């Protein structure tokens, strides 16, 4: 069996949806067109329901037929473990219902892995489709018992060391361990019968469900990390014209989770929402190209579309498909085929992509999400007083930097390497990360002391990991920030922070923060209040502005001032060595990468007008390698059309 | 035959030749005085109303010892008889005071026995009054909240499932849904109403049996009218402006009432029908879309129903309830027990009937030959696919009824009659469908059996117009668009894609720079036998298939819903007229062009043709009437309408009846 | 000391005590509180922070706070707050079980026996914020109490005439249940302490007044309190009318108190981060506005929640008057100016009596209960929703506030109907949809004896059993000299245009038409009878059955309601009471007396400087208090946006 690595040739692929009633002729037509569309890979849901017989034996014939037709057309298979479940369950169950159900799953894995491991075109086991859910089954006996046991094996006090009341987030910490346990158990079950094939899983809805996911632990039992990134389910925090930024952030979040493992996008939107989806669309040909290039530029080893062909009955019947109802290519399959073709014509370049890290990392943590859920009591009013502000704030910084043509990491705090000796020219952004503990504050102190730049806005560090506010009891970040909060005062959803000397008018959301400096240099507003500071801490710097300016940019639909302020704070080396825009461009993105020593840039225009983007930083002259609407450059000034995707190769 | 007439006895038996009546609920509860009740019947008689409806509350007849005391209702029946008023009597067993509408099914076997006792006592006693006109078996059968929680319903559903044999796969092997709940609910309504009819018939074989289905644009998926015909003498209805017409603005409650009348008329088949429950007065705290009907609306509603073959209009209510829910609400009389402008208006229509008995007793709607068809299964599949979302678009509950109602409105604004029928109420057995038209607008579920009926209809000369997602699914929510399109033969074409767009977009045709409003989804197709119609992007968006002697126009984008969303039915009117057989436009009075917020429907009585015209626009309108034969004589006009040679000048809110000389 | 109507008013604040705090921090709070001219604190006596593993009471945490209070001469309102979940911000409202009741008995014995011995204890707060919108009918203690209550009451399903009725068993039980538990808490305290004032803070009064029988509570309290939070309780108003909200809230509690002194136990002292329904941080200007409104309405105190903040989870670092460095915010600086004014003006400030115009706006429990039945709990913000029966009288209250006229805001049973003469008195019944025969006889007596009755909206449409006498035989026909004909629903906002006086009154939702017998009819420009004036003995009735107070609310314009109401007031009210020469949008005035001297409070909530011409009563304006340099010329006051002014009337 071929094993995926960081040097593998990336593929374009699609789900092949197999259910009873389909003909041999139909299935062959799908694999034939898939191969002709420069796709090398499919994913097949190994439905337990469609292998169980009246007598209780396993009949594999429906899936044998599909695997053999895949093999005939040289198509490799991602096989999803999908035990018997109700027909109406579109995504699959996330945990066993009962001990008896766990034994049924054991039997399912034994039978399916023992049989299908023998196909030479099997590429990977997907341990479970879309682990995690917003509706965790605390009602069910299996989960209820595991939670009770977990609480008894943990030793939590109702008071902290100083004597203050605390919350312990038992449910949230259990759910992390429970996901770790079930996925590790699935991996162990597969490994009883198959030690040869890659193990894979697709975390999903990552801007909501990241607080369920411990990716560093998952690395210990996976060969590759996957993902679902659907425009109609996962990108609700963005308008459609910023699905570029959404896909880039989603790719960066999975890339960070993968660490040293290769990653790929297991499940992308291939087609139309009729009745399905939260934010329904039919992707354009232009969007298909945008999403494949964004993922490959972010080190993806594959993009698999849900779905090649459609389900026929009830939920999503005739929805999501890349082929039309005559089983011929839509403009989406034609577009995807151009990217498969580009890969086959550019194998060495496309097999060795490394993202060009600017040195900017936007960090989120589980605990800011968990504390926010407790403090907002689950309200969904779309503001800072609602679920989602702790992810929308860092995503807004991410957007501002994308609109400056700067790459940024999007990482859980535990995925950041705090162990190095030197952080000169590195930048951490902590945007409205409302919960930080003493351990992470020491890591941030070390980072800044060793030359790091820390940017913090909104309610970053207002609470610890027990929802205890050190702002009230004795501020844990006083040392690092060289300053102390004074007040928060609630204002309107959108207000202006007007700096002394007109240096900036920053859009701000909901709360105005005021501070008192000791060691830091104060920054005053036109009302004579202290609204920000710069602290020199060892060899590094802190910029702290306790009003939500990233959320202010989001609310005002204008990232230009956040871009300008952030650029002014970046170490010179980042702007000298990284291709970026000469200024902020609304609804344009760029991210750069390297392959075998050569530098490349990806540029996408999501504005309504032709844009001329002046690219500066790094070295070399633009050669346009890919441009789907005949972009042209004059010196390093790129003229790019609405919805166009461009790859520049930088020569000498 | 002559055995039915010996059974009939002294009691009136309603027929398609009965003189229509205007009537009102007489609300009887304890605490009212003899003098008050007499005042109501006296004013009802003086208002040219011949008929009342009375709720025979079990609660107000049950005594401490469990005997029935009939005194309260005897008093009312005797005062009705004194003023020559006939009574529709509603069976309404003991129930909580707070239950405004009544329970829809028994709670338990024990409760069923209490209902049996109630029917025995009440029917045995009140059947003896010579002024009893009908038994209403149950008030407003059906509900949006069916009691699956209660033991009687839970057990009936379990038994039903055991007596049906469903597979999880179809003949070709594909997964299926069987809609067990929905099919049970049809059979459950059939069972309980048939049981109530059988219970009444134990004690009274003389009097008409009646029932009032309600909220028909939402609850039609509960109702099997063809089966109900087997135990009713007349079909009724509730059609309340404040409860049932939420899919329409108030200025189109004309169209809402016309469609509601057409839906019940279709359900009635060979039975006579009447409107059992119309809104007679004001909403204070009650209703979803609260109003107080204008005098003009009362006249509009009575004429629309009569023009659609109604044998009566009964207003809820003559007098008001006094305590809690609807206290001092809904009444046609004011708090001094005198006439509101609504009762004065209703009285003019009672007077017209007495002065025009032979005309008004023999109304037959002039069928254009256009039938707008809905089916239970499109509603059931929509409820499964939208997961019950209430966002008011194609991705929500209601689109499968709003789409056909939009075609209905376009035709109303062209002055053309159209039937509104459940697919099983359409007669597919004829040899010739020349000059007949079926509109299937976003009827998302069609099975092989109905497709064969449609093939036969078109082959034999029928015109079929299909828009939106018509035929996307079968009756098991299986999409033949995915597995092998069941309408390919009839349509001479095959779907290619749907692509979701905004709530309102334009279909921009290749030719004439022609534009159609469309809702939510753009459909593209590939033609084999059909003639393709292309858009400016070079995609095929519609086709005409010539199939035997008939034709099919198929446009798989929702253009009826596009007209609804744009609040403009003018293009849908023009397109539909262009597809009609010439004989329909030659033989039927209609407007020379589309008129926004005007309606006309035509009818015949004893060989003479008539037209009803209502102006709901803000301005005086001059409507040029063409088609059929004759010269306009204005027989009814409440605001001094005048005509010059078939051009009618009609005022805002005016109702006009033209007699064609 | 024992509170009385002659006590010197205080400014005070919650001192929030929880484990983890240092001696040094707590001392810093009491020191700054004393330096801020505050004499009083309130402390939540958390059972959770006194219970030991063995079940003994350890009082240490609260001893430390009481001793530091005493050192700085700060008196303590001590809230009885038995052991409860850390997540319970407000406290439980009733015992969960008989066993829980015994735990509460033990808690009261221990806490009252111990803390009664501190010389700086001022009052026991029997329970924090009695009442809740979500009553625990599910729990055994309440389930049993409701069963017993129903067995001891005998309700019929029909009235005397034979009509069906509702009996509102749940609502009547809840009144008796609140009365019982608060009386029981008072009796428990009195087992161990007969020396200290008993106090309680009813809250969210524009929603929860239907839970509260203040006349009964007087029998076991020494003072009535209140919570009046801008972020929880004033949702029926925009922020610019929180002046009117606070004035009405003060008037409602003042009416409930009767002969007892009252004070505001719980005002908003600081910022909402994640908490509150209508979140804000009060301005310095709002702090001053709220203290003066309450004192002008006879309040003996204003206590802010909170001096210092909670540290963990719910409201962590929220609500506090001090900043995160434990120094004064502009809110504490503002409150300190009012504490200073009181110390410099003790005799004036100790003897405030509100100058009653003679106008009383009456609400009743039963209108709220019948509305909840008729609207089925709908929250659509119109007359067909929960709240219209309180928003209607509050709208009249606002119209009068914008005329500079004081008005009482009273439950109907708090009005004294026993007097011989009501000459120059006015009752306004605005959309009080339920009235019974007993209250109608009291209103007949009131009008006969010289009273003026103003009724709008659906006042008297129903009786106390939700039976409409409008349907069966109108109970108010005698008093009104007229009979309803119809209601017809219209749009959310329409205009009632009088034939004669060219009043054009905004009206909400329903148009009422009537027929006059003895009354003089008032016709509109459509030729319909929409109102009447009935002469009844020495008094008069103005009846307009369309909602004109709710019309003013919906149009955001109280000017026409002001003009119409002024035209109906007895001359003596306009001659003897300071008021505005005309309607002023977003300005309020209320007047008071102390030791024979008359004063006026004026607040400008408009965006612009206003010049208000004050007329009525006697004397020349002297500005005694002004936070933005107001000036007067004769009796014409120039007042800045957000400014609070006290005029002393000299002659
Ligand atoms: O909703 C479309 C897709 C997506 O959710 C993924 C996976 O869950 C697949 O089963 C669904 O059909
Ligand atoms: O809501 C008004 C009417 C209507 O529902 C019909 C019937 O149910 C009657 O009982 C109601 O009073
Ligand atoms: O929410 C703010 C306040 C207020 O409700 C009062 C009291 O209940 C206190 O406990 C709260 O902290
Ligand atoms: Cl799968
Ligand atoms: Cl009835
Ligand atoms: Cl407290």
TrEMBL record, chain A:
Ranges of residues in domain Beta-galactosidase trimerisation: 360-547
An example Gene Ontology biological process: carbohydrate metabolic process
Gene Ontology MF: a single term: beta-galactosidase activity
SUPFAM superfamilies: (Trans)glycosidases, Class I glutamine amidotransferase-like
Entry superkingdom: Bacteria
Name used for this protein in its record: Beta-galactosidase trimerisation domain-containing protein
Native source species: Bacteroides salyersiae CL02T12C01
TrEMBL record, chain B:
Protein name: Beta-galactosidase trimerisation domain-containing protein
All copies of domain Beta-galactosidase trimerisation, residue ranges: 370-557
CDD domains with a match to the protein in the record: A4_beta-galactosidase_middle_domain
GO MF terms held by the record: beta-galactosidase activity
InterPro entries attached to this UniProt entry: Beta_galactosidase_Trimer, Class_I_gatase-like, GH, Glyco_hydro_42
Alphabetized Pfam families for the sequence: Glyco_hydro_42M
One annotated GO biological process: carbohydrate metabolic process
């Amino acid at each position: 069996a071929e094993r995926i690595s960081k040097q593998s040739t990336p593929f374009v692929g699609a789900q092949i949806f197999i259910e009873p009633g389909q003909t041999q002729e139909q299935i062959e037509q799908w694999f034939k067109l898939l191969a002709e569309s420069n796709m090398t890979t499919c994913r097949i849901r190994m439905f337990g329901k469609y292998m169980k017989t009246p007598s209780g034996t396993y009949d594999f014939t429906l899936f044998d037929r599909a695997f053999k037709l895949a093999d005939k057309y040289h198509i490799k298979v991602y096989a999803t473990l999908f035990p018997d479940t109700e027909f109406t369950d579109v995504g699959g169950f996330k945990f066993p219902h009962s001990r008896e159900h766990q034994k049924e799953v054991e039997d399912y894995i034994k039978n399916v892995v023992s049989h299908f491991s023998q196909y030479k075109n099997l590429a990977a086991w997907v341990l479970i489709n879309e682990p995690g859910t917003p509706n965790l089954p605390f009602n069910e006996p299996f989960t209820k018992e595991r939670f009770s046991d977990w609480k008894k094996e943990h030793n939590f006090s109702e008071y902290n060391e100083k004597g203050y009341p605390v919350l312990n987030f038992e449910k949230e910490n259990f759910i992390i361990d429970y996901h770790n346990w079930y996925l590790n158990w699935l991996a162990n079950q597969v490994r009883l019968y198959d030690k040869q094939h890659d193990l894979h899983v697709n975390p999903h809805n990552v801007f909501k469900l990241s607080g369920l996911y411990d990716f560093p632990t998952w690395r210990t039992f996976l060969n590759s990390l996957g993902g679902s990134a659907h425009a109609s389910w996962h990108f609700g925090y963005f308008p459609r014209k910023a699905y570029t930024v959404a896909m880039s952030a989603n790719a960066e979040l999975i890339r960070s989770g993968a660490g040293e493992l290769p990653w790929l996008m297991t499940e992308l939107q291939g087609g139309n929402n009729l009745y399905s989806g939260a934010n329904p669309l039919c992707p354009t040909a232009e969007e298909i190209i945008q999403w494949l290039w964004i993922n490959f530029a972010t080190e993806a080893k594959g993009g698999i579309f849900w779905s090649f062909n459609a389900r026929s009955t009830a939920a999503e019947a005739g929805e999501w498909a890349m082929i039309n109802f005559k089983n011929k290519s839509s403009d989406r399959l034609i577009a995807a085929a151009t990217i498969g073709k580009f890969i086959t014509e550019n194998v060495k370049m496309m097999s060795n992509i490394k993202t060009l890290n600017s040195g900017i990392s936007i960090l989120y943590n589980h605990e800011s999400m968990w504390v926010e859920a407790a403090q907002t009591r689950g309200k969904l009013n779309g503001n800072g007083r609602s679920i989602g502000a702790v992810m929308c704030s860092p995503l807004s910084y991410f957007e501002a930097l994308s609109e400056t043509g700067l790459q940024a990491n999007f990482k859980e705090i535990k995925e950041f390497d705090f162990s190095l000796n030197d952080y000169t020219d590195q930048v951490i952004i902590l945007s409205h990360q409302i919960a930080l503990d003493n351990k992470v504050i020491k890591q941030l102190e070390s980072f800044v002391e060793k030359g790091g730049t820390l940017i913090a806005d909104g309610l970053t560090g207002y609470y610890d990991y027990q929802a205890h506010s050190t702002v009230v009891s004795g501020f844990a970040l006083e040392n690092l920030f060289g300053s102390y909060p004074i007040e928060y005062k609630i204002k309107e959803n959108l207000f202006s922070l007007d700096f002394e000397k007109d240096n900036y008018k920053l859009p701000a959301h909901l709360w105005k923060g005021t501070i008192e400096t000791s060691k830091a240099t104060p920054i005053m507003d036109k009302e004579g209040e202290c609204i920000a500071c710069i602290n020199q801490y060892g060899k590094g710097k802190v910029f702290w502005i306790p009003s939500p300016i990233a959320l202010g940019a989001r609310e005002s639909k204008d990232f230009s001032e956040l871009s300008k302020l952030t650029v002014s704070l970046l170490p010179n080396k980042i702007l000298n060595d990284n291709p970026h825009f000469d200024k902020h461009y609304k609804d344009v993105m760029m991210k750069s990468f390297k392959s075998n020593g050569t530098m490349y840039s990806l540029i996408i225009n999501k504005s309504a007008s032709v844009q001329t983007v002046d690219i500066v930083g790094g070295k070399g002259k633009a050669f346009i390698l890919f441009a789907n609407k005949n972009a042209h450059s004059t010196a390093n000034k790129l003229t790019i059309s609405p919805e166009e995707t461009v790859i520049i190769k930088w020569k000498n």
